[PDB]
Chains A and B, each alone.
With several copies, the nearest count.
Chain A
Amino acid sequence: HARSTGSYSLVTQQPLGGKAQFGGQRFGEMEVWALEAYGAAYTLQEMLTVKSDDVNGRTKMYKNIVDGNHQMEPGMPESFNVLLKEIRSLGINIELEDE
């Protein structure tokens, strides 16, 4: 079973598992815990947003690692932005509190 890029759950946008579904294994929560036990910050981040669910992020990453762009514009992936839109639609204004 092998997967660099394949199909992701159109509902979940997270990758599948196995070469049959063209997905890698599940980072689950135990693998996440082990990753923290090591502490691969940007790696866990990419695995969590880019490698996990960055859809338009995937398109850009293709265009960018197309340029071999082995970096990222990180932080508060975008799920943060989605939750922000949701809370604002709930009439809960929030502030990106810069210190």
Chain B
Amino acid sequence: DLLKFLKAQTKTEEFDAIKIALASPDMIRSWSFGEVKKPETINYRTFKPERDGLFCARIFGPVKDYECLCGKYKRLKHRGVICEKCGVEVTQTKVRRERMGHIELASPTAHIWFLKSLPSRIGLLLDMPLRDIERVLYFESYVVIEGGMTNLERQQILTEEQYLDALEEFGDEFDAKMGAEAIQALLKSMDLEQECEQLREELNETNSETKRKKLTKRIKLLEAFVQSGNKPEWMILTVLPVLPPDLRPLVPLDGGRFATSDLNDLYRRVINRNNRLKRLLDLAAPDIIVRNEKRMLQEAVDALLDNGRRGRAITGSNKRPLKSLADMIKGKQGRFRQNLLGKRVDYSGRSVITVGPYLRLHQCGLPKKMALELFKPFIYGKLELRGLATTIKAAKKMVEREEAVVWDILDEVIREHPVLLNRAPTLHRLGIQAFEPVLIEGKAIQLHPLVCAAYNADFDGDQMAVHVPLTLEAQLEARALMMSTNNILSPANGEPIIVPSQDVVLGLYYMTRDCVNAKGEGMVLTGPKEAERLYRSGLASLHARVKVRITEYEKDANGELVAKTSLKDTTVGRAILWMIVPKGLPYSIVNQALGKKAISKMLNTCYRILGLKPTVIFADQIMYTGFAYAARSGASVGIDDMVIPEKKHEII
């Protein structure tokens, strides 16, 4: 028995669920690595932790990274070794930040939460009034734990004069006391089996709606308490676990003193009170003095737990309320919220976005200096892999040398090593995307053309955040989850996310523009090469309507691009566009004056038929073509172009 529990003790993995409950005294004792015997964490004269102190490294773990407290041993050759001269180990000094301690309370103290939190957990379990339960716990009212032969009842609030009179009257017939150990025993006495059975019997007997509902709710609460299985006796803390010496550090402040969270001072005071109480128990103090010391230790524990919530917060020399451990887990100060509120990160930078019209959809314009700022450790690793780096400091110097060898190695490392990039604001998930980063000599963030709207900003100077996906899983995620091309459609609307506009649309319309009596109207071009020559040589105007053999490679019932070659009267510019037109779209899908609406419609057809990758290729080609045709379109806007209406005056 209990040796196969080690098998039941699974291997190191991810807990599917989190078990949160009340540690039993043994649970805390195991959770600790010693029992304290000194209220001072550190010795002020030895500049070292006090023996049996809150910082007591021998209790709390290695004070030196690989060096003994006794100094009889040191170095990494002896990490984690127990010295008789020392009684400590030599694992990393975080061991003193690791091993914990215990403080075995002589009398258990209820969780300040267990009562103070309304509804009082203990109170709801005891089903008793708040003041009576407190005066019990606060040693301010005797509670007849059991009357036995005497007329007293069970867990019934009484008076000290009443308690004394009853004691005189009954000898040893009854069980009554003032304190919290009584409530602890009552929980230990509460037969939740018998109590729940009686509650169910009463609820069945209770025919009144209110009485039945109350008995049923009590039975349900008792059933929940049983199902949790948390020992109701564990509701009172009979031992004080200690934070690690560094977890509760008495940090040596400027001037030889020790700076600590006020919880540490509360712990020191509670330790002093507990030591006094232990001496009293050893010395067999008067019961009045014993009760006073017990109340004092209990109050010290309560203050160390949650100052101000119960009683008055111990105001230090600065008179501020004491920092209890609850405060450390209270609010955004509790690491949940304030950490989740904000976190500036590394492997990332901010620089103004530049419109890198040259780059492909995957390509990214990475400030080469900023690039250097980035893969600097990656660069050092490459150079060591290049063997040239023998010392990391030397690697830093060669980086400082900014070597062409360093520059070449950077060019190598950059190869298909895309890392995260982001453009504020975080409106749509498309607002942040990575790209294949190619170093650009300087300090500008060159960006792809159509990525504008998705980046949720404009070229008005957005400093952009670019995180480094160093991890291979993160790199595979940059390739698959952050694949910008894999963000083709509207996440919210499904629609294409990069539909054409403006300059590309301008060139598109220009090529789509047709002229009457143009430069060589009514000719025959065999195909895109022929018209490309004619206009590129200037033999014809781009806006010339001409018939050209259009090889309409059109997907069959099996999807095969069944060509339908035919000389079709179309535009020279339209003819040129048909070259950009992929095999699988209608000639009429381009054989007309086309614009940003038409461009978007064609793009949609491409996403449909051409799927993803062919559509993306067609898109990149279309972008380059639109920029080129717009530049060649050689048109501007003139102030004279603003032809005011002729009869505007007559209308007025």
Contacts and interface: CB of A to CB of B under 8 A. Distances in A.
Q: Are chains A and B touching directly in their complex (CB below 8 angstroms)?
A: yes
Interface of A: 1-6, 8, 12, 14-19, 23-35, 37-43, 46-48, 51-52, 56, 62, 65-68, 70-72, 75-76, 79, 82-83, 85-99
Interface residues of B, number: 83
B481 A88 contact: no
Nearest to B240: A91
Given A93-B31, A97-B18, A31 B344 contact: no
B325 interface: yes
Residue from B31, B98, B341, B465 with most neighbouring chain A CB atoms (10 Å): B31
Contact of A2 (B16, B340, B373): B373
A78 to B, nearest CB: 11
B251 interface: no
Nearest to B238: A91
B192 interface: no
B342 A28 contact: yes
B374 A38 contact: no
Nearest to B102: A91
5 contacts: A19-B349, A28-B341, A40-B481, A46-B470, A89-B243
B64 interface: no
B351 A25 contact: no
Residue from A62, A76, A79, A94 with most neighbouring chain B CB atoms (10 Å): A94
Given A68-B381, A93-B27, A15 B426 contact: no
Interface of B: 10, 13-24, 27-28, 30-32, 94, 98, 100, 237, 239-244, 247-248, 325, 328-329, 335, 339-351, 367, 369-370, 373-378, 380-381, 384-385, 392, 420, 422, 425-426, 428-429, 431-432, 463, 465, 467-475, 477, 481-482
Contact of B377 (A5, A31, A97): A5
Contacts, number: 231
Contacts of A27: 342-345
Given A4-B374, A31-B432, A68-B381, A94 B343 contact: no
Nearest to B336: A83
A91 B239 contact: yes
Contacts of A72: 471
Contacts of A85: 98, 100, 243-244, 247
Nearest to B22: A92
Contacts of B422: 25, 31, 34
A93 to B, nearest CB: 3
A23 to B, nearest CB: 5
B426 A30 contact: yes
Given A4-B375, A89-B244, A91-B240, A52 B349 contact: no
A88 B28 contact: yes
Given A28-B342, A85-B244, A93-B31, 18 more contacts: A14-B344, A25-B350, A31-B426, A32-B343, A34-B429, A38-B481, A46-B471, A56-B94, A68-B381, A71-B471, A76-B15, A88-B241, A89-B241, A89-B247, A93-B24, A95-B15, A97-B15, A97-B19
